């Protein structure tokens, strides 16, 4: 049976060194059997879980009280977290499946 | 849902100095990175400044040559472009915009430097 | 402008145009491509983020595309509606900074 999967925004974040950076991944799930994982893509190109929700610690996630939207927030960033992130839906029943946003960037500036 | 007005547009004599504001609505402000750009009467865009949500950090077209302050209030969802020593060439409509790119523009705001 | 685009375009109703922006490594070679539309008497709107992903809103004629450090629009099915100044733009990693392209003017001829 066909779902959606979660989208992920904004597609480019520019941000200095130090400050935080927040993405939103949005999801409409059909049930409550899921869990929302945030990914970040290696040099390997393969990704790496930076956290989940429910529940490095540079790296958290927020649900909104809207019941559609999750805040994920790279607190104190720092040059070397540039790279591509992405969100992930797992459908827990009644087959476990992920589904991938689209990739977004974020670009992490030297302080001048 | 999003909405994007500019304020503070109108004449300037060269020399002179003008705040521009721009208010927001329809989206989570506080964590949102906003933009201007600008556009010369028959020219192209040219983006003038980028700010984080938290405002520690901004970005600045070279060519203004640090005449130009990017700001923001979270508390009032509202964006500052502080333009000084302004001169013809600075002449243009003046956009705000949500996000590095503008996934949502205001209709923009003419500024007019002019004796 | 450090993307480049060519002044202008044309086609006639129903065929397919490319507008090419062509960048550097700092820019187009590393990071994404975005498109605008600007018709006439409006404000910008986006029409590709992502070298090639299209808001909502925006019909499936219109893709983006990106190689190297070229990137191309293409608007197929073109209509009258479609005469508009197009821009280009991407991040520049090497000087911190956001351009656009210097625009492309599109007519609709026949």
């Known amino acids: 049976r066909p779902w959606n999967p979660p989208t992920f925004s904004p597609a480019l974040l520019v941000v200095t060194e130090g400050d935080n950076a927040t993405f939103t991944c949005s999801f409409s799930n059909t049930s409550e059997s899921f869990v929302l994982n945030w990914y970040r893509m290696s040099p390997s190109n393969q990704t790496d879980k930076l956290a989940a929700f429910p529940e490095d610690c540079r790296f958290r996630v927020t649900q909104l009280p809207n019941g559609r939207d999750f805040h994920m927030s790279v607190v104190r960033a720092r040059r070397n977290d540039s790279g591509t992130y992405l969100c992930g839906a797992i459908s827990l029943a009644p087959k476990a499946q992920i589904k991938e946003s689209l990739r977004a960037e974020l670009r992490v500036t030297e302080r001048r | 849902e999003v909405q994007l007005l500019e304020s503070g547009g109108g004449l300037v004599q060269p020399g002179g100095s003008l705040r521009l504001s721009c208010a927001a609505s329809?989206?989570?402000?506080?964590?949102?990175?906003m933009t201007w750009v600008r556009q010369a009467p028959g020219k192209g865009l040219e983006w003038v400044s980028t700010?984080?949500?938290?405002?520690?950090?901004?970005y600045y077209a070279d060519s203004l040559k640090g005449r130009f302050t990017i700001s923001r209030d979270n508390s009032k969802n509202t964006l500052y472009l502080q333009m000084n020593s302004l001169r013809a060439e600075d002449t243009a409509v003046y956009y705000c915009?949500?996000?590095?790119?503008?996934?949502?523009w205001g209709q923009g705001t003419l500024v007019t430097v002019s004796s | 402008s450090v993307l480049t685009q060519p002044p202008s375009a044309s086609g006639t109703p129903g065929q397919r145009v490319s507008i090419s922006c062509s960048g550097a490594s700092s820019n187009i070679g590393s990071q994404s491509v975005f498109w605008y539309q600007q018709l006439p008497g409006t404000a910008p709107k986006l029409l590709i983020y992502s070298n090639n992903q299209r808001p909502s809103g925006v019909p499936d004629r219109f893709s983006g595309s990106k190689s190297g450090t070229s990137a191309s629009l293409a608007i197929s099915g073109l209509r009258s509606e479609d005469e508009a100044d197009y821009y280009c733009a991407a991040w520049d990693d090497s000087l911190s900074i956001w351009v656009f392209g210097g625009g492309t003017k599109l007519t609709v001829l026949g």
């Open positions: 915009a949500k996000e590095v790119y503008g996934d949502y």
């Open positions: 700010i984080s949500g938290s405002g520690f950090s901004t």
């Open positions: 329809g989206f989570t402000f506080s964590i949102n990175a």
